Write a protein that binds this ligand. Structure first.
Ligand SMILES: [Zn+2]
Ligand SMILES: [Zn+2]
Lengths: 99, 82, 88, 109, 95, 99, 83, 110, 93
DNA sequence: TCGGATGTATATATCTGACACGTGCCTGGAGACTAGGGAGTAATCCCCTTGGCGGTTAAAACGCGGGGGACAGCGCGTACGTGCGTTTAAGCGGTGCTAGAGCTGTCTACGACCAATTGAGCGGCCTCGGCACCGGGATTCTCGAT
DNA sequence: ATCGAGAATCCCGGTGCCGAGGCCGCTCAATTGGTCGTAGACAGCTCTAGCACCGCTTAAACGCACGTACGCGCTGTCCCCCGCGTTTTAACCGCCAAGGGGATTACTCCCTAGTCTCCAGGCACGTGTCAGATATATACATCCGAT
């Protein structure tokens, strides 16, 4: 009889765990590699200082957290608890960046 | 030359970010869309930042130009100068 | 009615049509010549002076300025003569 | 008050006034700057800074810490109403987010 | 060689913090955030005053310019308190 | 046999009629009176240029038209065709005009 | 010259017409109260901004140019009334 | 171009240059204004105005009218997305909206 | 009286240069006047901020170039910078 | 599937007021010359950013059981679109009053500008404690068993 | 309802370490003073549009009755993320290297601010006239109860 939690309770525990915490979420090296991807795409032979990519990560995660707040609101609107594509497209339009 | 790096935004990273947003259950289709919107946001921000840097005849970008690019998008940020 | 190479000469540079692009005025010109007459000029049609700048943006966002049917016809009838201009 | 001292002290303030006056002048906002405008601006800046630091200090004391960190500033800005309305849009680095769970999402028997 | 001069509002924020909470310290990151906040608010108020002065064909940024800009920019109670304390400060300075 | 349209068809007809047309939609006298109420609540004895009232009303119709686009698609997100208040509060919340 | 509850002056057919321009068919019966509320809040915001511009210039009448300035300050720039 | 004519004609533009230079100098943007900035800015304005005017003229002609009205400007701005992206937050007096209805809102084919 | 300064005649001239037949109403003329003023303010403010960022004190051509690149979206910005540089070169020579 | 019923697109007279064009001048724009300082350009230096191992290991991928939740369908009883008669208050017109917006001229207290000056504030170093963290113990939700 | 086992969490203590804060050096930016050209305050004058009123027409709102679309709740089904256990890999920490370009200074020049004179492009003003609003008469697309 192994211990087995019901689905969602540990998810809520780590709701609290990652809201009371402040550390960065996206793994640093792949993220800065993706930033270098975009940079060399737009203009070749570009160099980055650490503070620049750290600020980029700050803004990126803030944007994603806000978008996820909005998508959670949208999902709650449809009497659902599982976020879905259409929630994301609705939020992305409604904030005004796609129209 | 390196490519196909959008997958660097891993599964549990997206799960943790959406979870910080108070989301419990995430459908399997969410992750590719999050990668796409993140890619678009990086494209815009990097475009503005590299424009700023190329203007100043500097071939290396700085956090000051990054935060200026954020501000110009109506996305000002605190904690790196300004 | 398939015109000969003389009509296939671009009306400006007197050279053949390579990657033809068709404006709404049915006027066609080569892509190097098209670029030279839009980016280096007043954004006017080289023949009737019409400005298709809005059309230019509309069909360059999707990169669909090229008229594929005419290019296929030309490469069917003048494959080697068009390959002559490929080298530089 | 008529005094021969720093303009901040004459105004009874701690923010610089001559420096603020210079940034009004050399900042290229108008070719002429009034004499009392920098004093007013310094007073407003001191009021806002005092209020936000007071809220941050209260939050830090509630967190058993005697030092201000970006998390405390983020909590102070978000929990306040009008400070939120002023700074609701902007994001603070290393600030986390408010502990907030939707009521519907709360567990049920 | 000698390093250039880097302006910051660290000492003034420290002074006001000691005036409010005499025993509370502050970290470097929070200090930089406070400096950036001061810079942002200063830029907003000064720009609003600049446009306002250009609006009425004026040429001087007077105290009334800053007062009206503050009334425009800050929310109600904050604007009222800021206006009151700024009026107190300016009348003390001119008196 | 009295003639009665099925519920909805004339609704679409008048949707098209109002979308293709650009006339003013709110009677100017009640709007002017309400604007005067707000003004006298702010400060007493103000005077109104007719162009100023026109600008107020144009801004108001722009705001309501945008908000109704947004709340309509928010309502149809929940598999519905009737817009109820919760659509409006959610749309304003996720737009960010009420926090 | 005080006035009474002219928010009712924004009559039900006005909201209906605005919603029809908004691309809707079916309107909930109690939509009107919060539509009036949001209209009202938008109004005191814009009127506050315009009135404080007018106050700044020793003027006792608000002009359309002040109104468009105020709308511009709210991220809602408007064209067709000068400037 | 060494022509000793007005700067608008000398540069081939059609918007004024002296007016733009004065506004830049008297607009309090910098203590010094470069000599090439006003003509460049006038050219940019000329491009944008030409684009919008030709779009509005096409819209009006498609509407069988010989005079651009604000509705035509609104239709030209919204129908294109590039300008609409440039002019997302702006509103036009007596502009109206694009005629469109969400596909779900359309009636069922019975 | 006082003199009023506007771009009405220039907009009319450009329209006739593009559309030699269609006219324009007064209200649309005001729309375009406000539009030109708005873009003027946007680009000028962006250029001033950008010059201040690099500690310069003069709006050269490249300042307006970068401002137009930032403000206008990509492809419109491309055509704008293209014929703006063309016009500057024409003015110089 | 279909034949009335109805709102919509289309063609023609008409007439009107906003739109397109001639005018004078004047006030802002163009041209010539001067001055001085902002910016470019050479050099250089040293801060830091890219590239590179290499051991560890926390976290990511993968598999699997399953139970919560998405979703389709049924049914209803409500809420709201539709249409018509009523009433009401907007919209237009015309007139009358004048407070205040706009313009002019005058005088001056405010503020730009330059030389001298000295201390406020920032750069660099040193230091003592506030919190990070490991380790342990009591507390505390959470799930199954009735 | 209940009670008990089991992971997870709050609380308490010792160790330590680097960084927040204080002190010294000193360089340059704020202070003070005086002067002078002037934007602005103020007084005065004009006359425009805003305000207020009247009366008339009728467009629109309003209320009621009604029939029906559907919002919501319930039920059942299935399917697919969640939680957990196992395995692997690249993130990561620490160290090391090279060079390159960001940043700084010093010099020179040429590019724009300023001044003045002169002059015509645009604008406030006045005037003709047809593009488009308005009404009436048509045909046509589309709807809906009924075959
Ligand atoms: Zn060619
Ligand atoms: Zn052509």
């Amino acid at each position: 009889k192994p211990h087995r939690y019901r689905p969602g309770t540990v998810a809520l525990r780590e709701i609290r765990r990652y809201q009371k915490s402040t550390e960065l979420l996206i793994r640093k090296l792949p993220f800065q590699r993706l930033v270098r991807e975009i940079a060399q795409d737009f203009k070749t032979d570009l160099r980055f200082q650490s503070s620049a990519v750290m600020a980029l990560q700050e803004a990126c995660e803030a944007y994603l957290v806000g978008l996820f707040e909005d998508t959670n609101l949208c999902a709650i609107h449809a009497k659902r608890v599982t976020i879905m594509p259409k929630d994301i497209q609705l939020a992305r339009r409604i904030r005004g960046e796609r129209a | 030359v390196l490519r196909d790096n959008i997958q660097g935004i891993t599964k549990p990273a997206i799960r943790r970010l959406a979870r910080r947003g108070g989301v419990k259950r995430i459908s399997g289709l969410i992750y590719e869309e999050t990668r796409g919107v993140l890619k678009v946001f990086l494209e815009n921000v990097i475009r503005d930042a590299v424009t700023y840097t190329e203007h100043a005849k500097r071939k290396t970008v700085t956090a000051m130009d990054v935060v200026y690019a954020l501000k110009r998008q109506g996305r000002t940020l605190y904690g790196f100068g300004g | 009615a398939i015109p000969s190479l003389s009509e296939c000469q671009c009306g400006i540079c007197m050279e053949i049509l390579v990657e033809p692009v068709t404006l709404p005025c049915n006027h066609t010109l080569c892509k190097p010549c098209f670029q030279s007459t839009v980016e280096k000029a007043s954004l006017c049609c080289p023949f009737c002076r019409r400005r298709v700048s809005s059309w230019t943006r509309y069909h360059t966002r999707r990169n669909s300025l090229v008229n594929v049917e005419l290019w296929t016809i030309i490469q069917k009838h003048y494959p080697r003569e068009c390959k002559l201009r490929a080298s530089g | 008050s008529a005094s021969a001292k720093t303009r901040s002290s004459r105004a009874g303030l701690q923010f610089p006034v001559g420096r603020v006056h210079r940034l009004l002048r050399k900042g290229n906002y108008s070719e002429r700057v009034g004499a009392g405008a920098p004093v007013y601006l310094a007073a407003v800046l001191e009021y806002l800074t005092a209020e936000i630091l007071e809220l941050a200090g209260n939050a830090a004391r509630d967190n058993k810490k005697t030092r201000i960190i970006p998390r405390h500033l983020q909590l102070a800005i978000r929990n306040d109403e009008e400070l939120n309305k002023l700074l609701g849009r902007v994001t603070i680095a290393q600030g986390g987010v408010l502990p907030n769970i939707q009521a519907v999402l709360l567990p049920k028997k | 060689r000698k390093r250039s001069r880097k302006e910051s509002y660290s000492i003034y924020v420290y002074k006001v913090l000691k005036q409010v909470h005499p025993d509370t310290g502050i970290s470097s990151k929070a200090m930089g955030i406070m400096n950036s906040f001061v810079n942002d608010i200063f830029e907003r108020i000064a720009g609003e005053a600049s446009r306002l002065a250009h609006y009425n064909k004026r040429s001087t940024i007077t105290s009334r310019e800053i007062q009206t800009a503050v009334r425009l920019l800050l929310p109600g109670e904050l604007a009222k308190h800021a206006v009151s304390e700024g009026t107190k400060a300016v009348t003390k300075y001119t008196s």
